[PDB]
Structure formats: structure tokens, C-alpha cells
Nucleic acid binder design. Sequence first.
DNA 1: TTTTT
Length: 436
Amino acid sequence: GLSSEQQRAFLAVTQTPHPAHLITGPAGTGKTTLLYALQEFYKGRAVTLAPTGTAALQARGQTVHSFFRFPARLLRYRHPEDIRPPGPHSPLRKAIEQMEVLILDEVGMVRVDLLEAMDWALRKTRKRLEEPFGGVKVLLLGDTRQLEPVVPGGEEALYIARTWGGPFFFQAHVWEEVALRVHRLWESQRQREDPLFAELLKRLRQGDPQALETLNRAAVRPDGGEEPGTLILTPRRKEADALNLKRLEALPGKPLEYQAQVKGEFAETDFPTEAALTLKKGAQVILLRNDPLGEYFNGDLGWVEDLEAEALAVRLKRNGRRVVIRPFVWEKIVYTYDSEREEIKPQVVGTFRQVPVRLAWALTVHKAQGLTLDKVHLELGRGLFAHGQLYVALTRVRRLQDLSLSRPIAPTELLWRPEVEVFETRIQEGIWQKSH
DNA sequence: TTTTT
Ligand SMILES: Nc1ncnc2c1ncn2[C@@H]1O[C@H](COP(=O)(O)OP(=O)(O)O)[C@@H](O)[C@H]1O
Ligand code: VO4
Ligand SMILES: [Mg+2]
């Protein structure tokens, strides 16, 4: 059963014809758990999406990209080359046409161009350009104090700035057409049996510098990452590799190497996994691509069972089922700027073919947002770089005894986005309306 | 530098 404030948000969302709602609150307040109640109330009529694979599985839906078949690149505003409606007799078109409610968890990580593309895709497929999201009622859930959207730094960043003025979902132009009603949750549920830890996280969210000093004294334990049953989180992918390789070549099985084929321009900075990736039987892994046959998805955690030339078997954590993994192809897209028409054109400059698997004793903080973890050791590596990164790493566990840091954290390490301050200030009035 | 395919 839901809590009291969860039930108020349940009724305030399902008892009103209003088409746009946001349920927001600190990490672990029960937003995705109330999302489960919304899925039972709506079940056939609702589609549930999340921006990342891990969040999508945590919300028991799929990624936004996978549902609308969006390409994994910048979705220019209302651009036909990027937002293509489904076929005349496709299962997607009937899904979009029959759909009545769109639930979107972890909306804080949804970049503005992704949200505007959903708006346009729903309008175009339902043949209602007049109405935002094509008449679909959208239920948004997330926290803007958690991880900001991912914005690579090419002309992709300049376009987003020019078109919307920022990468956040609340900067979409559709909010000039609808008022977003805001429901707020406050009471901790993940940390409900450790109120002092919950109070600490509340103060850390407010930016308290003395809260950070109390955390540095209580939680800095360098060897925390070697205690059993501990998931390690890091800011960067390659820092996770160095940590996973330590636990990997400590396993008894025979190692097998999967060598990627790189074509054209594809820097190893952009590799989703290592070009020389070594696995062992029993290694803990996370899957990086969706199965066309639907047996596994991006974000699936599991353990290697068999290793052969270009095919490995993985036992999944999600359902205890055994799936077979084969190499996928990744495209590397860059954006060039025409001076004459003054437009950006995407272009493929390289490919990367490899088994879609990473070792998963250590993960990036981005792959952890939304998870409730039993034990977390945060390895800071070469520092934090994303707004909301530290706060997400700290709030995955239930009790402070389940958390440890590799080194103390300085106040000057902390990132604050001014657009998030402006947003979270106006939302306490209960409404978000983008003017002009 | 993190994500999506
Ligand atoms: N009303 C509730 N009663 C008991 N446990 C709850 C309740 N709401 C949430 N939880 C638990 O708290 C943990 C984190 O909650 P979650 O739904 O992930 O919150 P959020 O989405 O805000 O992070 C989950 O493991 C869930 O089981
Ligand atoms: O509010 V969270 O589902 O990122 O813990
Ligand atoms: Mg959640």
C-alpha cells in the first residue's frame, strides 16, 4: 500500500482531466513505486517510458528511444529527418493511436530535444497537430536535483542552446501550450528506517557545507569497495573498467577476449565498451543494447555462463532466464554547420562492432539513477563532472552503514545549475508555465 | 564526459 502523500498524488493525477502532471521529490520518496500503482490503474491504456535502460527496467517499461524508434542522435525541433511517424500498418502506430496516458519516469534525465520529439511524434501520428502530445495525458516523474541531461559538446550543444536555451525538459516549447501541474513528495521511503541518514541527505540536497563535512567524517573508507556484496559507482566509464578488471582477473575461469572491429573515425573515448574486452565465466555484466527478439534489453544485469567465438550466454538478474549475446554495431555521428542555410547536418563517420556487454562490478553513476542498492562504495576517480552526480551516488542505499567513499569531498567540487534553481523555485507554487 | 540506437 502507498503512503499518505503518495495517495494524494495518485488521486490528484487520476481524478482530473488535466493532461500534464509532474510528480517530483527527493530520491527514494517513492515516485517509481507510485508509478507501479499508476500502471495497475491504467494498465492497458498507458505506455511507460524512461530516458535510460536501467531506469526503464526499474519502471518496468522501455526507453523513449526504443518506443518511438528515435535515432540515437540529436532530434532537431520538429525535424522530419529525425521524427518519422510509424508506418501505415505498424504496431507502433496502433499503439500511439490507442494510447491514452504516457508515463515518463526519471524525467530529470530527459533532454529537451527528446521531450519535444515525443510531443511532435504524438501529434503527427494521432493526426492532431492542435493538441500537445496529441491529446495523450502525460504523467512525469523525476527530480531535477539528480543527474542533468547528457549533452556532448559539439555543435549539438550550440543547437540546443539556440533552439531552447538549455537542455532541461522544462525548457521545451510545449510548456507554452500546457500548464504542468506539480505534485511533491517529501517523506523518505528508501531511508525511512534511518532518519538521521535521511536528514543528512536532505541537508546535502540543500547544499549544506556542514552536512558534507559530517559525511566526510562518517563515510570515508578507502577499502569499502572490497567488502562483499558491494556495487562500486564511478563518474567515468574507463574508471569502472580499471576497477572491474581487478575483480575480473581474480576469478578461476579461463579468460576469453572479444575484439571489436573499428571502421572509419571512432575515437576510443566514445567506445561504449572496450575494444579488447575480456570475460570469464561467472563475471558480473550489464547489457548495453536491446535484443531485437525482446529477450534482453539495455540495462539488464547478469552473469556470464558460456563464452564462445562471437556468442556468449548470460543469465539475467531480472528473470533468471538465460539469453545469448552477439555483436552489435554502434554508429558515431558528428554534426557539421552549413554557413549558407545555417543548419546542422548529422553524418556517420565511424562504426564500432562488439559484444554489447560491460563488466558490472563497477558502474557509472548515470547507470545507477533510480536503483535502490544494498551497498555502495563511491570511487571518485578524477572528480565529479555532472550536476546531481554526487547526490545520486549517495542516495542509492537505505542506511549510512551501507555507504562508503574513497576520499573526502570538498565543497568546491559541487556543481549547481542556475536553471534548476529557477525551476524548483516556481514549482513550489504548484504550476510550471513556460511563458513567451 | 555521462546517455540514447
Ligand atoms: N509506501 C511505501 N511503503 C514501503 N516501501 C516503499 C514505499 N514507497 C517506496 N518504498 C520503497 O522505497 C525504495 C525506493 O523507493 P522508490 O519508489 O525508488 O522512490 P523514488 O522513485 O522516489 O526513488 C523502494 O525499494 C521501495 O520498495
Ligand atoms: O528519485 V530516484 O528513483 O533517482 O532514487
Ligand atoms: Mg525511481
